[PDB]
Design a protein around this ligand. Structure first.
Ligand SMILES: Nc1ncnc2c1ncn2[C@@H]1O[C@H](COP(=O)(O)OP(=O)(O)O)[C@@H](O)[C@H]1O
Ligand SMILES: [Mn+2]
Ligand SMILES: [Mn+2]
Length: 269
């Protein structure tokens, strides 16, 4: 079977309890994870160890907190105590774990399931081929010996409008924001980088990225995490918001793809 789980955020105990509830069996089952495996919850170290150990039985996409962790590890960004990353950063296998983490995709595609996963979703300004190329471009930088320079460049909120003409720093920053930070769009598809509230509490004319018809969403289902204030609710058919805020005292949600059945694990917090 195929299981999809939203943002874990170091909530290792809840992740394992949820997987035991469905009797997840590597080799027979496959787990998809929407990213943000680390930070806020207490068990980032254990989560990375476990997910890395799954090998081909897990399909991960990186989120914004995974990238921030990489930036801290490389000395590009300062550690925040509230992220609770020190045990992971100080672990004897930190290098092995983070060098594995930075080689993971930004985007997962399964044609037989007609299923696409990214941390924040797929901007309506992208078709599938563009999304694939952009993912490949950023993944190439992250898996290279020079990834600290990319991480340092990634921070920034502009440009917020896609063009095949974008080059250099602006192109990479847009790709990163689209994959790992996007929530709301302007009517033309342009990204807003400030509102993090629920669709009902947002100011006009902002709309959820998934409320704007885009070519990927017309052909494929899309699963994503990231947007906790959405609470996994209010999406159209074919759009699956899996982040229900476990690390915030909400729940960890698992979706079995074959029957679209939900399984939920309450936060221990
Ligand atoms: N259920 C919720 N309702 C409203 N806001 C929430 C909810 N859960 C989390 N938030 C808020 O969402 C804001 C952004 O958190 P999050 O969605 O995890 O994304 P980010 O990676 O940008 O931090 C946080 O400041 C948090 O207070
Ligand atoms: Mn996120
Ligand atoms: Mn998150």
């Amino acid at each position: 079977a195929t299981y999809l789980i939203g943002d874990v955020h170091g909530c290792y105990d809840e992740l394992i309890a949820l997987l035991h509830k469905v009797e997840f069996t590597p080799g027979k089952d496959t787990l998809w994870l929407t990213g943000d495996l680390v930070a806020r919850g207490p068990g980032s170290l254990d989560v990375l160890r476990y997910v890395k150990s799954l090998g081909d039985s897990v399909r991960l996409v990186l989120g914004n907190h995974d990238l921030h962790l990489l930036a801290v590890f490389a000395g590009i960004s300062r550690n925040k105590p509230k992220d609770r990353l020190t045990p992971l950063l100080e672990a004897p296998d930190a290098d092995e774990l983070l060098n594995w983490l930075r080689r993971q995709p930004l985007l997962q595609i399964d044609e037989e399931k007609k299923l696409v996963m990214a941390h924040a979703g797929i901007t309506p300004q992208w078709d599938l081929q563009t999304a694939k190329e952009c993912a490949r471009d950023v993944e190439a930088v992250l898996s290279s010996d020079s990834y600290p320079f990319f991480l340092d460049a990634m921070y920034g909120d502009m440009p917020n409008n896609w063009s095949p003409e974008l080059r250099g720093l602006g192109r990479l920053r847009f790709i990163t924001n689209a994959f790992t930070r996007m929530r709301f769009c302007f009517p033309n598809g342009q990204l807003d980088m400030y509102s993090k509230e629920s669709p009902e509490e947002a100011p006009a004319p902002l709309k959820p990225w998934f409320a704007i018809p885009g070519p990927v969403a017309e052909e494929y289902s899309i699963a994503f995490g990231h947007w906790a204030s959405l609470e996994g609710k209010g999406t159209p058919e074919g759009i699956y918001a899996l982040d229900t805020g476990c690390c915030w005292g909400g729940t960890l949600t698992c979706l079995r793809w074959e029957d679209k059945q939900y399984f939920v694990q309450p936060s221990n917090r």
